Amino acid sequence: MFINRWLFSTNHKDIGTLYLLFGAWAGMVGTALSLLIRAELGQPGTLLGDDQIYNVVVTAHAFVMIFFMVMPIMIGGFGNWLVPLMIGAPDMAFPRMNNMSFWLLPPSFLLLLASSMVEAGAGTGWTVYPPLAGNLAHAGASVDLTIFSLHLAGVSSILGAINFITTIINMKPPAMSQYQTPLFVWSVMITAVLLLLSLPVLAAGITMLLTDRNLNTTFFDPAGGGDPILYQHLFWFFGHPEVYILILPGFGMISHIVTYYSGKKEPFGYMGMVWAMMSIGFLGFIVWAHHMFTVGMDVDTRAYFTSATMIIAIPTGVKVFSWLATLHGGNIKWSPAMMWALGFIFLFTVGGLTGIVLANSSLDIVLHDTYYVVAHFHYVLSMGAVFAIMGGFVHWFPLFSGYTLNDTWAKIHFAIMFVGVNMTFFPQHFLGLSGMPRRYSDYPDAYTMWNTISSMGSFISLTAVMLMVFIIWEAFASKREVLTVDLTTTNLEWLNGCPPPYHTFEEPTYVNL
Amino acid sequence: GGGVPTDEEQATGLEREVMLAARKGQDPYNILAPKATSGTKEDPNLVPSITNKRIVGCICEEDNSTVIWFWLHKGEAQRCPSCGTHYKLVP
Amino acid sequence: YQTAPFDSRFPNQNQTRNCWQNYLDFHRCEKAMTAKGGDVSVCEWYRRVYKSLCPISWVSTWDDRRAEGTFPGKI
Amino acid sequence: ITAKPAKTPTSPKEQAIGLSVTFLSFLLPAGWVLYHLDNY
Amino acid sequence: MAYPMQLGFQDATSPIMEELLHFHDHTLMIVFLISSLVLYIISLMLTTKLTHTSTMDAQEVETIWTILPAIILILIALPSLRILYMMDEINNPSLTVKTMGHQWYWSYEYTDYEDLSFDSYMIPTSELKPGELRLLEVDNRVVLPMEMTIRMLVSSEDVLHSWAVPSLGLKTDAIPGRLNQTTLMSSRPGLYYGQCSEICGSNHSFMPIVLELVPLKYFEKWSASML
Amino acid sequence: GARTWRFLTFGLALPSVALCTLNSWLHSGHRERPAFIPYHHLRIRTKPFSWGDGNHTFFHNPRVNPLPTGYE
Amino acid sequence: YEEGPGKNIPFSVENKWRLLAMMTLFFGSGFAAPFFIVRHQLLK
Amino acid sequence: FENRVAEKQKLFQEDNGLPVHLKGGATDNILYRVTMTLCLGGTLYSLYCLGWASFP
Amino acid sequence: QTHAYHMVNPSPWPLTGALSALLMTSGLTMWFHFNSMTLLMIGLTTNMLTMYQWWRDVIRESTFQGHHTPAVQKGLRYGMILFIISEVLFFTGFFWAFYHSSLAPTPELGGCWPPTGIHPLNPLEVPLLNTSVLLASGVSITWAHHSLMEGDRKHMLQALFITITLGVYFTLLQASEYYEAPFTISDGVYGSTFFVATGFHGLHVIIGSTFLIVCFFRQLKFHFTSNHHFGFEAAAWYWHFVDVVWLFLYVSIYWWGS
Ligand code: HEA
Ligand code: HEA
Ligand SMILES: CCCCC/C=C\C/C=C/C/C=C\C/C=C\CCCC(=O)O[C@H](COC(=O)CCCCCCCCCCCCCCCCC)COP(=O)(O)OCCN
Ligand SMILES: CCCCCC/C=C\CCCCCCCCCC(=O)O[C@H](COC(=O)CCCCCCCCCCCCCCC)COP(=O)(O)OC[C@@H](O)CO
Ligand SMILES: CCCCCC/C=C\CCCCCCCCCC(=O)O[C@H](COC(=O)CCCCCCCCCCCCCCC)COP(=O)(O)OC[C@@H](O)CO
Ligand SMILES: CCCCCCCCCCO[C@@H]1O[C@H](CO)[C@@H](O[C@H]2O[C@H](CO)[C@@H](O)[C@H](O)[C@H]2O)[C@H](O)[C@H]1O
Ligand SMILES: CCCCCCCCCCO[C@@H]1O[C@H](CO)[C@@H](O[C@H]2O[C@H](CO)[C@@H](O)[C@H](O)[C@H]2O)[C@H](O)[C@H]1O
Ligand SMILES: CCCCCCCCCCO[C@@H]1O[C@H](CO)[C@@H](O[C@H]2O[C@H](CO)[C@@H](O)[C@H](O)[C@H]2O)[C@H](O)[C@H]1O
Ligand SMILES: C[C@H](CCC(=O)O)[C@H]1CC[C@H]2[C@@H]3[C@H](O)C[C@@H]4C[C@H](O)CC[C@]4(C)[C@H]3C[C@H](O)[C@]12C
Ligand code: CUA
Ligand code: NA
Ligand SMILES: [Zn+2]
């Protein structure tokens, strides 16, 4: 029974549960990697070794946080649990293919941990640029194991994207138009379209890197007429959409949490929010070379990529202002989920604005490959994607489990994490402006105070992560069973109880025209 | 030149049940959107069910993005808590 | 001559083809001048520009390939 | 949300044990590695 | 170079770096104002017991929400692109210098007139002379004439590197098989430091750049002495 | 209809294949291999191939594919 | 299949102390792994 | 050939509680066991290969 | 249930598929670096066993059990369209690589395309024959489709057999051209782009021919009705995708790149 249920699943809820467990484990790995980074940088000098061991840690940190923590939790976990329930569907379109999306991730993760155990690891950065990632400067199995890790995670998400798009298009009640689906459902459909189009281009690029490393191709090798900058275009053609993939489902969860804890039946400006997410998804395909402003491209190309990148602020601004307009006039409940969501609105805005600074090619000459970039992306990932995950987790844990968290503990957890992430990343702006490069194991003495403070911040964030594990334990240990949930009239996912039965919507909803 | 079976000859299981019900203008597997009545207490929307309760979604006005969801129970007609439209379960 | 002037054929950050073209032009001119037994000093401008722009290792590699018979450009 | 009282209440003492065990499970193995870095 | 507790950019050594400081001041004011306005509006939405939970009309307010940001982006883009095109403008350099990135050191080639080339390696921490900077000094500095437009050409003979000097506003990627061009003009004599700015393996942290800016006559005699 | 697509298959598509098969047939026969020149952008070897002696491509044809050192 | 709180999960919550052990091993193994990988790389 | 789909419809709709991957009879169980044995054995061998490749 | 959707029986094939992916990738690693094919051959075997049993079960669920209602079929239509789009974007990366290298040939090539020392195939010889063959197969598969809709078993089988024969002809012609080519995958970016792009295309032709052969045996076994035959539609869509990728390769690499 246990094998049939948990290894042979065709159930959207159990598969969502598997994704959340996987993502939680991955988050502990990514946290450990982040503390090794900050331990190395927490005093001047060398702690671990030279830049190779250091950049193996940095590279693994990024892959684990992106591919094994954020994507599995947002898309595999919240997407599988909530999407079918929010459209009254009985499961996903391809419930057996859904299970293979999940089971590809343990092997993907095994190949990444194998990369780090064999030879000297893949000390390449998560971008895996040649020729450093090539067979001369990274001889041996490490980079190939990283490529194969990415291939399996790629297939997982491509099949997952086919599943979500089909489910969301084909399995709504027949009276429900696409303009009557919840914002979280829109956020997952748009994310799935980005994955479907972007991951195959990554697959092509890392396959070329694989053949340059093993079959004597020369896509990226000037000796054969290749070009290292071609790899960068193919990678970033995927990589910019990838960051929109990382935040879009977070946008969707934020819309639900703000609406819910404002005591509103609906988000402000629903069609604006749909427009904004589709605009961000589209613009996210035409900006990739803002990752390449120092490679030597032509001035008019730099002018185009600057302008196109800045345009993203307009639809993103409509969402931020629409969240504020949802709070406006609310009966505000100061739940732990609301605290995560309010931290999201503010800290995501700050990281979005440092992204607009970086969009300026002329200024990016001096900010590129500095901690200013590191500050920008940790505001949007470690205070944006992560705050949306934590908000969604504390909001929907009682739906998934049938048990309540201790709200006081959850507020403590929020407060500690808020202090730690800001102490970690705010000073990295100063390190960036003043010229500290990325992917350094050690720094000139002038950079010591801000690196010291940043590392102290990382330890506060570790305390929050440890407390979170205790808080989940306390909920399962105490077994406070959910009774009533407010606002079920505009939150269908709650209307089958906590937890919902294994089979929901065996009899579909009645919706007339 | 023949030899290809038809759905009439070879469709089976749920596919066949859907096929045979549609010939009779019937929709036991909820493929079509039901058409609203005036939704008054005298002319309530009639909600078929194989059990004693079913979830209703009410799109109170044309092109509302917000759907209002509630359990409809066997017995007296209930009202959408947003627009007051009447619904009655017919198990 | 101080350094290679701005060349409107090569106005962008990537100056690879500027080095290459001037190296080709010098060696084509040198072959044309050694052939009719004319004077290689007419080639001097191309020589100064490629020496200014081209990395030593590129010139060194190209010269080795011309001697080997493996230079892939047309001279 | 409303909920029932805990079916198996976790006393303050029980919470101190769970929190202590949780923290030690993170801190002891990493601490053992970092303490021994020189030897590595 | 950077100094302890530094918050902003290194002081500008070149006119373009001066331009970037003023453009950053303008952009940062906008970032401060928008961040501040969002935090203030959050705090305003959350500090009243007054309520309004019925459906709210969106279209009027969405005009403000799109037009005002569009205007603000234009006010960033205009000076941004003026500086972009100013750096690209034709200038007539007096001197061309090449740098080649290597694992893990820079070589320099000054081949306008004579075959002058040398390697530039980090001074090990244990060999620093009193008063010298950890991880920043090199054995052989890049001596250059002050107050002169110099063409720097950047490549690599192995993996990617990136040749950066923050106080001159410079960062040009060092790509094997590619010759990337930038221009350098120092308003002042002195020593101007940078660090390899593309992950390039074991000693990426330990291959810095030191420019030594001196009068032309000193540069000429130094050049002659380095053959 | 089926009738029309069969008409196209036999009346246009397969006659085209037959004519191109003729064309290829008439232009087949081994043309003379070029002088070997050890160009550095060709016969790339950054890592031995994972089969044979490591120095032969997967569909190596001795008649027309020189090794880095020339024809076999 | 079992339905309801504590039954829709691949781990038991019947005993809070056995659960603490299982959770300790689960999250603890994830957090430990990178420290042991670094130790492994340093010891070659 | 003759149309024997009706006989396969009867076999696969038989009320015997078997999942579809085993409903053809004893041959399905054999091919299932071969597949899962190669997968699990192969996975254990891949772990042994990692252990080997993790040291010089 | 009173909806039309398919609740799938718990299945081991997702796990066997995931593990076959681990064995193929770890197997390629073991082949490239540790001189051994063992893991790779286990992974290819388990991958083929997984595909066989999974698609067998899809036939059981549809032809034999009747779970493919119109709503289910519509979902499969979208799934196959989306899968084809993802394959289009995969090929787009290789076309980008090709145009990048060929539009700005580097000094190492002689600064020209084709590179110095590269003698391209004549696009009017076997490459043109291959074009005629795949276009012809696009016509015959359309004949097969209309035959099936019109209820004509014999003509469906003849048209589908012709379509498969042309797919096999293309594969044999390409194998022979690979063997005869005077350039290899190691002949710089010309060989790299030529063999990786045409090689992935060749793999897709083999996959598509395999799918058409599956449809051929299912047709022999009377699985398809005149109205319900999604496996055939999906194979036909895939087959048109393979034709269209060939036309782009022919124009780009063989003709414009010669
Ligand atoms: C979730 C992840 C995420 C998100 C959503 C973003 C969003 C944005 N990012 Fe970022 N980015 C990263 C993750 C992300 N980024 C990562 C990981 C890297 C490094 C990659 C690597 O090298 O490893 C990076 C790097 C990166 C670079 C390259 C810098 C360099 O390497 O030199 C640039 C350049 O333009 C960029 C810009 C932007 C911009 C303009 C947005 C916009 O989408 C932001 C828009 C939001 C707002 C602007 C705020 C809200 C708007 C308002 C309140 C309205 C009013 C505003 C105005 C009038 C301005 N980011
Ligand atoms: C999602 C992406 C993400 C996240 C969250 C983080 C989080 C953190 N990151 Fe990092 N980081 C990157 C993505 C991320 N990072 C990327 C892409 C790079 C660039 C890599 C490269 O250069 O190639 C990078 C690089 C990077 C550097 C620069 C290294 C260098 O240039 O040399 C540093 C330096 O301090 C750093 C530190 C941290 C710290 C201290 C945290 C801490 O904030 C982490 C704290 C812990 C958490 C936030 C919890 C996570 C766990 C969960 C959320 C699980 C939840 C469980 C349930 C819901 C059940 N990271
Ligand atoms: C008739 C056409 C049919 C193709 C069948 C041929 C071979 C096996 C597999 C083919 C798969 C296709 C592409 C893989 C890459 C390279 C092969 C290119 C096509 C080919 O077969 O190229 C040959 C070289 O093969 C070589 O190196 C062979 C190398 C064999 C090992 C391939 C390595 C596998 C790569 C991993 C694939 C990753 C997949 C990504 C999935 C995406 C997930 C997101 C050309 O022969 P040559 O002697 O150099 O020149 C001819 C001289 N007379
Ligand atoms: C370097 C080597 C790395 C390679 C890693 C390889 C990774 C994994 C090994 C794959 C094993 C595949 C096993 C067969 C999978 C068949 C999936 C399938 O056919 O899925 C179908 C849905 O997808 C659809 O239609 C349309 C989609 C069909 C997709 C088929 C499988 C594709 C796997 C590779 C995709 C890569 C993408 C290439 C583009 C970059 C059916 O959905 P189910 O939920 O089953 O059933 C629903 C029931 O109603 C049916 O009666
Ligand atoms: C040497 C090469 C080795 C590499 C591995 C790949 C090799 C071969 C794979 C060949 C693909 C064969 C697919 C067979 C699918 C059979 C099942 C099927 O076709 O199932 C049909 C549904 O379609 C469906 O699921 C549609 C399912 C579609 C899946 C097709 C996907 C193509 C897969 C490519 C996978 C790898 C590609 C990655 C390349 C980089 C069943 O419905 P109907 O037909 O309507 O029947 C019902 C009627 O009888 C009722 O009257
Ligand atoms: C980034 C995450 C980590 C953050 C910091 C973790 C905090 C440390 C927790 C304690 O860790 C322990 O510290 C002991 C020392 O205090 C070590 O004992 C060591 O030192 C003792 C005292 O010298 C000896 O008795 C022991 O034998 C010897 O192993 C012990 O091994 C180690 O587990
Ligand atoms: C269902 C269960 C799954 C099945 C698992 C099967 C595991 C047993 C495989 C046998 O192991 C082999 O050992 C050989 C040692 O004799 C190796 O030969 C290879 O490595 C040799 C080592 O010297 C070299 O001679 C050559 O590279 C080559 O013959 C080869 O790598 C390896 O496969
Ligand atoms: C159902 C499971 C039970 C069966 C388990 C599978 C048993 C397979 C073990 C055999 O191992 C092989 O031995 C060959 C020779 O020892 C290797 O060829 C290697 O050596 C050859 C010649 O020695 C070379 O030609 C090849 O290039 C090379 O890969 C080959 O790779 C390797 O797989
Ligand atoms: C006799 C048999 C009848 C099929 C049936 O009605 O059961 C016929 C119908 C169509 C025939 C096939 C098609 O005519 C196409 C092929 C023609 C070749 O000459 C023989 C094999 C070939 C693949 C045929 C095999 C077999 O004779 C088939 C399958
Ligand atoms: Cu050289 Cu980094
Ligand atoms: Na350090
Ligand atoms: Zn209503």
Author numbering:
A (entry chain A): 1 to 513
B (entry chain F): 3 to 93
C (entry chain H): 11 to 85
D (entry chain M): 1 to 40
E (entry chain B): 1 to 227
F (entry chain G): 12 to 83
G (entry chain L): 3 to 46
H (entry chain J): 1 to 56
Anything the authors wrote about it?
The electrons from cytochrome c are transferred through CuA in subunit II and heme a in subunit I to the O2 reduction site, which consists of heme a3 and CuB. It has been proposed that the hydrophobic channel that connects the transmembrane surface of subunit III through subunit I to the heme a3–CuB site is the O2 transfer pathway.
To identify CO2- and N2O-binding sites, we treated dimeric CcO crystals with CO2 or N2O in both the fully reduced and the aerobic fully oxidized states. The electron density of CO2 or N2O at site 2 was remarkably strong and little changed in the aerobic and anaerobic conditions. These results indicated that the affinity for CO2 and N2O at site 2 was higher than that of O2, N2, and water molecules. The hydrophobic interactions that sandwiched the ligand between Phe67I and Phe68I may affect the stability of ligands at site 2. Under an N2O atmosphere, the activity of isolated CcO was partially and reversibly reduced. The O2 consumption rate slightly decreased in the presence of N2O. Although the binding of CO2 or N2O to site 2 does not block the O2 channel, it may inhibit the diffusion of gas molecules through the putative CO2 channel.
